[PDB]
Amino acid sequence: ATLKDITRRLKSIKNIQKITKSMKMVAAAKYARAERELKPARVYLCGAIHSSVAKQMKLANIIYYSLKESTTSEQSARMTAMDNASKNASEMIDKLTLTFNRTRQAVITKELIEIISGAAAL
Amino acid sequence: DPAPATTFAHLDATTVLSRAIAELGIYPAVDPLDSTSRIMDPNIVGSEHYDVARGVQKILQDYKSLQDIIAILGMDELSEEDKLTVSRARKIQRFLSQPFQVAEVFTGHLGKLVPLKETIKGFQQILAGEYDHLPEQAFYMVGPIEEAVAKADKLA
Amino acid sequence: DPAPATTFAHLDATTVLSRAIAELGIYPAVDPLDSTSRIMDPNIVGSEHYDVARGVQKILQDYKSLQDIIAILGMDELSEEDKLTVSRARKIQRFLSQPFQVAEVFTGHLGKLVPLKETIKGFQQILAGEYDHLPEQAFYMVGPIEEAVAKADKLAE
Amino acid sequence: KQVAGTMKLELAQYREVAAFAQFGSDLDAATQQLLSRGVRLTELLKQGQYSPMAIEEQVAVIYAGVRGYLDKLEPSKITKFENAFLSHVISQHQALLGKIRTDGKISEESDAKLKEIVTNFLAGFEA
């Protein structure tokens, strides 16, 4: 392990957590708008949206419908995906900080004991 | 770290002052959910005190959760229940502030030394819903709960 | 480390090499963000030189910061302008490498010596957008910018 | 004190959303304005070496951004604006700089005269 390593990972993963955190809320807003417009329609990093449709996949009437269902779904999915990803980043930050502080303490101790052993051997 | 961890062996409580809390104008800047205490035990501070303390703590924790939706996702689709959690929580959070006798000379306001009995009653009543008909500012920088109602009337 | 650390103050200019940069095949493995010079002042090496140099460090530091993020979140989240600076940062990174006469036994390339002006010009042109159309690998291990355009051509099929 | 308190408040809000900046493809006008002020202010915080400025020049430049005058100016230009603007006030507006000093703070008059200078200067700059 290395304090250099942890410190950088920590800096990156802390930015990832905030960024992803923001996306969660953005999607969330889009999801709200999209759901309001989903009312009238039925009277006629997106989680796993893309994968589902593409796997099962391989006028104007339906088009609008799908599109409306699509946007709602995607934003719900994305919201969920980013919410979870920022949570995962949070836990990983906490865990990395713990490792950082164990290493920081072992390093202090280890350097000091070298100094004492050298001193004492005189 | 060996220093703080050795210290904590002897602590019976912690008082946390926060720049954030401060900035909300809540004085003292005591963080209500960070500050902890060992004697905060039913068998020690009594069951009443305990239930009200926890009750305030939870209302605050819930509010925190809800806040994400409130300002961002629009504070409108809030269930009858959620509407009150937010309103009471904000009053309680404001009622947690208090004029100190020490600041008197600067704030030009009598400091209020509030008796444990008064404290328990107040927060108990706000959790209850008895004061759900007063403006927030009425619970801001007061002492005894009575003074909260009094300010309300004066503010209208 | 105490040895290298205490040496710094004794210098007027420092060129700091990095194993990480060497590992990528960028030679010389100079760290553009950790090499300094007392004379790097507009009043000495001049304005054009000074601005270009700071302009290169900046785009390189910007990139360095997006790296770790976009490696997880995917580059698709980058806006056109951002993915534009990312493209030129990598080109600049490669144009910073150079075949050494002394290193021919290792690079398998003919050493190259680039005069100050040419260095300034080329980098200034990359910063300015003038070579957004050449692939990165054209800038890898060449001398003057002109060779970057040649190599770009060279890549036919 | 006056101008500093505002800039510090705005930079702190900026530091909060700062990360979302380069990834906020579709950000709401609320946080979008926070990013714009923040960059502007950050730019005004840059200063070349060997040229320490007087307190009144400091407050005048901070004023420009903290008052939103440079919100629509492109961030890359801010530095250029600052030097030209400051040279102008040091040249033609010594009285204003004097007032800001002597009067202790930014009076209603000074604030009014600053409005006219920045807005007109900016327009010529973007011309």
From Swiss-Prot, chain A:
Subcellular location: Mitochondrion inner membrane
Modification sites for N6-succinyllysine: K24, K58, K95
Domain of life: Eukaryota
InterPro entries: ATP_synth_F1_ATPase_gsu, ATP_synth_F1_gsu, ATP_synth_F1_gsu_CS
Gene3D superfamilies xref list: 3.40.1380.10, ATP synthase, gamma subunit, helix hairpin domain
Record's function text: Subunit gamma, of the mitochondrial membrane ATP synthase complex (F(1)F(0) ATP synthase or Complex V) that produces ATP from ADP in the presence of a proton gradient across the membrane which is generated by electron transport complexes of the respiratory chain. ATP synthase complex consist of a soluble F(1) head domain - the catalytic core - and a membrane F(1) domain - the membrane proton channel. These two domains are linked by a central stalk rotating inside the F(1) region and a stationary peripheral stalk.
Family from the record: Belongs to the ATPase gamma chain family.
PANTHER family, sorted: ATP SYNTHASE GAMMA CHAIN, ATP SYNTHASE SUBUNIT GAMMA, MITOCHONDRIAL
Subunit structure, interactors included: Component of the ATP synthase complex composed at least of ATP5F1A/subunit alpha, ATP5F1B/subunit beta, ATP5MC1/subunit c (homooctomer), MT-ATP6/subunit a, MT-ATP8/subunit 8, ATP5ME/subunit e, ATP5MF/subunit f, ATP5MG/subunit g, ATP5MK/subunit k, ATP5MJ/subunit j, ATP5F1C/subunit gamma, ATP5F1D/subunit delta, ATP5F1E/subunit epsilon, ATP5PF/subunit F6, ATP5PB/subunit b, ATP5PD/subunit d, ATP5PO/subunit OSCP.
Protein name: ATP synthase F(1) complex subunit gamma, mitochondrial
Gene it is expressed from: ATP5F1C
From Swiss-Prot, chain B:
Residues annotated with Phosphoserine modification: S47, S65
Locations listed in the record: Mitochondrion inner membrane
Residue positions where N6-succinyllysine is found in the record: K154
Signal peptide: none
Domain of life: Eukaryota
Subunit structure: Homotrimer. Component of the ATP synthase complex composed at least of ATP5F1A/subunit alpha, ATP5F1B/subunit beta, ATP5MC1/subunit c (homooctomer), MT-ATP6/subunit a, MT-ATP8/subunit 8, ATP5ME/subunit e, ATP5MF/subunit f, ATP5MG/subunit g, ATP5MK/subunit k, ATP5MJ/subunit j, ATP5F1C/subunit gamma, ATP5F1D/subunit delta, ATP5F1E/subunit epsilon, ATP5PF/subunit F6, ATP5PB/subunit b, ATP5PD/subunit d, ATP5PO/subunit OSCP.
Entry's family note: Belongs to the ATPase alpha/beta chains family.
Stated role: Catalytic subunit beta, of the mitochondrial membrane ATP synthase complex (F(1)F(0) ATP synthase or Complex V) that produces ATP from ADP in the presence of a proton gradient across the membrane which is generated by electron transport complexes of the respiratory chain. ATP synthase complex consist of a soluble F(1) head domain - the catalytic core - and a membrane F(1) domain - the membrane proton channel. These two domains are linked by a central stalk rotating inside the F(1) region and a stationary peripheral stalk.
Designated name of the protein: ATP synthase F(1) complex catalytic subunit beta, mitochondrial
Gene expressing this chain: ATP5F1B
Part of the full-length chain shown: 369 to 524 of 528
From Swiss-Prot, chain D:
Tissues expressed in: Heart muscle (at protein level). Heart and liver.
Keyword Ligase tagged: no
Source superkingdom: Eukaryota
Residues with the N6-acetyllysine modification: K1, K8, K72, K80, K105, K113, K115
GO molecular function: ADP binding; ATP binding; proton-transporting ATP synthase activity, rotational mechanism
PTM annotation, UniProt: Acetylated on lysine residues. BLOC1S1 is required for acetylation.
Residues involved in ATP binding: Q47, Q49
Compartment list: Mitochondrion inner membrane; Cell membrane
Role according to the record: Subunit alpha, of the mitochondrial membrane ATP synthase complex (F(1)F(0) ATP synthase or Complex V) that produces ATP from ADP in the presence of a proton gradient across the membrane which is generated by electron transport complexes of the respiratory chain. ATP synthase complex consist of a soluble F(1) head domain - the catalytic core - and a membrane F(1) domain - the membrane proton channel. These two domains are linked by a central stalk rotating inside the F(1) region and a stationary peripheral stalk.
Record's miscellaneous remark: The siderophore enterobactin (Ent) produced by enteric bacteria binds Fe(3+) and helps bacteria scavenge iron ions from the environment. As a consequence, the mammalian siderocalin LCN2 plays an important role in defense against bacterial infections by sequestering iron bound to microbial siderophores. LCN2 can also bind iron bound to endogenous or nutrient-derived iron chelators and plays an important role in cellular iron homeostasis.
Family statement drawn from the similarity comment of this UniProt entry: Belongs to the ATPase alpha/beta chains family.
Protein name stated in the entry: ATP synthase F(1) complex subunit alpha, mitochondrial
Source organism per UniProt: Bos taurus (Bovine)
Protein's gene: ATP5F1A
Residue window of the full protein shown: 427 to 553 of 553
